[PDB]
Amino acid sequence: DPTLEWFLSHCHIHKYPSKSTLIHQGEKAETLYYIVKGSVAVLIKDEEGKEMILFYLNQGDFIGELGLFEEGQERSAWVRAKTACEVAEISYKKFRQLIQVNPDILMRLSAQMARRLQVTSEKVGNLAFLDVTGRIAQTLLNLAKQPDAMTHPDGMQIKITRQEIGQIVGCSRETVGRILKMLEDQNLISAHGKTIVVYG
Amino acid sequence: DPTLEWFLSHCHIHKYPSKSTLIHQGEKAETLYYIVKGSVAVLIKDEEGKEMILFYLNQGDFIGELGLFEEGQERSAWVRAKTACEVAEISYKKFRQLIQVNPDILMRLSAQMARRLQVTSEKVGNLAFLDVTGRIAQTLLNLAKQPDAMTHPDGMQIKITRQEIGQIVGCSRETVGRILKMLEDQNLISAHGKTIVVYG
Ligand SMILES: Nc1ncnc2c1ncn2[C@@H]1O[C@@H]2COP(=O)(O)O[C@H]2[C@H]1O
Ligand SMILES: Nc1ncnc2c1ncn2[C@@H]1O[C@@H]2COP(=O)(O)O[C@H]2[C@H]1O
């Protein structure tokens, strides 16, 4: 991918250990990132410091793009390393020059923005239309749809903690545990340690 | 704006009467739109066909952009004229050519995508974190912030139906009615037929 190589040749790459915060909500935005290796969580917080996970981003994803198109923006969310990460960084002004040179790099970034808006909109609908059981169920389905989900003779299998499910749906880890027990009883799912099979 | 004029010279413009649906969820996406005049609502539905309003778009806004960056996409939402509209239309293929010619047109589109993702993310946090009252109240404030809100000696005045407020916050028209009554009692707002005076 010559496009990617050319873009990256203009970035400076930095390593972030698991759990480190790459981006703090409210900081002034002047730089774009790209995940060469690793995975991160994008999250927001309520007034009680409870975190919610808006998105998981991985190798190939841009981050910190939302301040690119208007100056004086603040970072709209926190971004925290789930794994150890290699992350390329580049100033907004330099990136703008790259765009004038070859707009395919902006098309790639924008393609990701479009996907993120589609998925985030779906999350709005889930939060507004479903009760807690429905939200948890739909989250299990969505995770069953991820590339890293592994086939199972009963359905599709995923790994994730009660805590993480809770951070995605907006509930406590306890509530999540009770609801997963129910879905197991209704023979819709199966549970293990940190492994779940979704029947479908 | 010469960049906008240039762009428009490549579009074909069409008129849509109030209430007409410009875009149906699920259609195959191959064309981009731009609102020369008028305003529209972007909405989604539950399985029972209740509608929720994700966004209001106006003169200057692109629409139907989400299918641009990958082929074989379906329209992610319904878009319906709130007023009568003049809307420019152009094939994705042709728009891609325009981008190669002058990427500023893609920068404009992408600036809107970025704003939409920021605001939609905030909506996720509101649904997750606030109760129907914090939500209804905040919605009243937001509408009080709109350019079409008219000054009042008590505060700022807006017009909108219980039904519409409910479609924005994700609750029934009845629930909305009861909550507005409460906010009237707490002397935070005043009500009329389809008119509300947000105090302060
Ligand atoms: N809803 C979302 N979906 C995916 N990524 C997001 C979302 N909201 C914020 N982000 C990412 O969080 C980043 C942190 O700061 P920025 O606002 O500069 O750019 C942001 C986006 O890259
Ligand atoms: N969350 C949103 N905020 C603003 N506009 C949206 C949102 N979700 C969908 N739209 C618009 O609805 C359009 C309908 O089809 P597209 O998916 O082609 O492109 C879409 C966007 O223009």
Side-chain angles (χ1 to χ4, degrees):
Chain A
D1 188 335
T3 303
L4 298 182
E5 292 301 333
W6 167 70
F7 159 66
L8 291 176
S9 67
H10 295 85
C11 299
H12 48 100
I13 302 183
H14 302 290
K15 298 191 175 185
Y16 294 80
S18 182
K19 310 295 186 175
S20 55
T21 296
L22 317 196
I23 297 177
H24 302 268
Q25 177 181 102
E27 292 178 298
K28 298 293 162 289
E30 295 180 296
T31 64
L32 180 71
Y33 306 83
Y34 175 90
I35 306 174
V36 177
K37 189 170 185 179
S39 64
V40 301
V42 181
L43 59 112
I44 55 180
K45 297 182 192 179
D46 64 25
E47 302 174 354
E48 192 170 351
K50 292 172 291 174
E51 297 174 337
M52 180 175 194
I53 298 171
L54 286 180
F55 221 99
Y56 285 121
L57 300 175
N58 302 300
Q59 176 175 349
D61 287 315
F62 290 90
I63 330 168
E65 76 285 358
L66 304 176
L68 174 59
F69 309 96
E70 305 171 14
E71 299 181 345
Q73 296 290 265
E74 299 178 339
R75 300 295 190 188
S76 64
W78 292 263
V79 182
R80 184 182 298 155
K82 288 171 55 62
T83 58
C85 295
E86 302 178 0
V87 184
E89 182 169 358
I90 184 177
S91 69
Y92 284 162
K93 306 186 179 191
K94 186 166 183 182
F95 192 69
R96 296 180 187 116
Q97 298 172 357
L98 301 192
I99 288 164
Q100 293 298 318
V101 176
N102 179 358
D104 182 41
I105 195 67
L106 182 55
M107 292 287 286
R108 297 191 177 210
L109 176 54
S110 296
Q112 298 177 7
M113 303 183 70
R115 176 75 350 92
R116 294 166 195 188
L117 191 59
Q118 294 165 332
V119 174
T120 301
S121 299
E122 189 180 338
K123 191 176 300 292
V124 171
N126 291 341
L127 290 164
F129 293 143
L130 303 177
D131 66 9
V132 66
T133 298
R135 287 155 52 189
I136 293 179
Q138 181 67 222
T139 293
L140 296 183
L141 294 187
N142 292 347
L143 294 176
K145 293 152 59 180
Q146 303 301 146
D148 49 339
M150 301 184 62
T151 301
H152 184 279
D154 299 340
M156 204 67 55
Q157 175 173 327
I158 65 178
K159 77 167 187 298
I160 183 173
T161 67
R162 303 298 181 273
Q163 219 289 322
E164 299 181 10
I165 296 174
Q167 291 179 327
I168 299 173
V169 308
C171 291
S172 72
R173 310 63 185 176
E174 296 74 3
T175 296
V176 167
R178 304 190 305 268
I179 300 298
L180 293 174
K181 175 47 171 54
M182 280 211 306
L183 300 175
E184 191 159 34
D185 293 347
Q186 302 172 164
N187 194 48
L188 299 171
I189 66 174
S190 180
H192 181 66
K194 182 179 179 179
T195 293
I196 301 175
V197 184
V198 178
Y199 302 164
Chain B
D1 188 314
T3 299
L4 293 170
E5 295 296 345
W6 170 70
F7 159 67
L8 291 176
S9 66
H10 295 85
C11 297
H12 49 99
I13 301 183
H14 303 289
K15 298 191 175 185
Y16 294 79
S18 182
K19 310 295 186 175
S20 56
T21 296
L22 317 197
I23 297 177
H24 301 268
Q25 177 180 102
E27 291 178 298
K28 297 293 162 289
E30 294 179 296
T31 65
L32 180 72
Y33 305 82
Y34 175 90
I35 305 173
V36 177
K37 189 169 185 180
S39 64
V40 302
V42 181
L43 59 112
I44 55 180
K45 297 182 191 179
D46 72 356
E47 302 188 1
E48 299 296 352
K50 301 188 299 177
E51 297 174 338
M52 180 174 194
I53 297 171
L54 287 178
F55 220 99
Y56 286 121
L57 300 175
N58 302 301
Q59 177 174 348
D61 286 317
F62 290 91
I63 329 168
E65 73 286 359
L66 303 176
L68 174 60
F69 309 95
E70 305 171 15
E71 299 182 345
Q73 296 290 266
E74 299 178 339
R75 300 296 189 187
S76 65
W78 292 263
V79 182
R80 184 182 299 154
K82 288 172 55 62
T83 58
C85 296
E86 302 178 0
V87 184
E89 182 170 358
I90 184 177
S91 69
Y92 285 162
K93 163 185 181 173
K94 185 167 183 182
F95 193 68
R96 296 179 187 116
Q97 299 171 358
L98 301 191
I99 289 164
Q100 294 298 318
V101 175
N102 179 358
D104 181 41
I105 195 67
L106 181 55
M107 292 287 287
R108 298 192 178 209
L109 176 54
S110 297
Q112 301 178 6
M113 301 179 70
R115 175 75 351 92
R116 294 167 196 188
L117 189 60
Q118 294 166 331
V119 174
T120 301
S121 298
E122 187 180 339
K123 192 176 301 290
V124 170
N126 291 341
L127 290 164
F129 300 152
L130 297 183
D131 67 344
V132 65
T133 300
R135 288 155 53 188
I136 293 179
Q138 181 175 357
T139 294
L140 296 184
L141 293 187
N142 292 348
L143 294 177
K145 293 152 59 180
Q146 303 301 146
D148 49 339
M150 301 184 62
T151 301
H152 184 279
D154 299 340
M156 205 66 56
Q157 176 173 326
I158 65 178
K159 77 167 188 298
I160 182 174
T161 67
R162 302 298 181 274
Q163 219 289 322
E164 300 181 10
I165 296 174
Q167 292 178 328
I168 298 174
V169 308
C171 75
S172 72
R173 310 64 184 176
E174 296 74 3
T175 296
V176 168
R178 304 190 305 267
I179 300 298
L180 292 175
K181 174 47 171 54
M182 280 211 307
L183 300 175
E184 191 160 34
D185 292 348
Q186 302 172 164
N187 194 48
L188 299 171
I189 66 174
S190 180
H192 181 66
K194 182 179 179 179
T195 293
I196 301 175
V197 178
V198 186
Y199 296 139

